[PDB]
């Protein structure tokens, strides 16, 4: 019965029946990432903030004298 389904003309043995299924490619699939993959120093952040605030305070002093 299975010979009626998968067998081909001139098949000599039942062990010669083809199998074509969903299969990985030869060599398999390539590897993948599994695990988790990953700022500025606080001195640098505080220095930039101090520079901006110092410029602001200088401008405040200048506009106060003009007023």
Give the interface with other proteins as residue ranges (CB under 8 A). 3, 8-14
Place of tokens 């220095």: 47
Decide whether 3 or 45 has the Cβ nearer to other proteins: 3
- The tokens for 37 are 């993959």
Decide whether 3 or 44 has the Cβ nearer to other proteins: 3
Decide whether 3 or 60 has the Cβ nearer to other proteins: 3
N-to-C CA span, the chain = 104
Report how far residue 15's alpha carbon sits from residue 64's, in angstroms, rounded to the nearest whole number.
99
Q: Rounded to the nearest whole angstrom, what is the least distance from the CB of residue 16 to other proteins in the complex?
A: 9
């Amino acid at each position: 019965t299975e010979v009626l389904k998968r067998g081909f003309p001139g098949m000599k043995s039942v062990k010669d029946m083809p199998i074509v299924q969903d299969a990985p490619p030869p060599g398999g699939f390539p590897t993948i990432r599994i695990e988790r993959r990953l700022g500025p120093t606080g001195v640098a952040i505080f220095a930039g903030l101090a520079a901006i605030m110092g410029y602001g305070f200088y401008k405040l002093h200048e506009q106060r004298q003009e007023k």
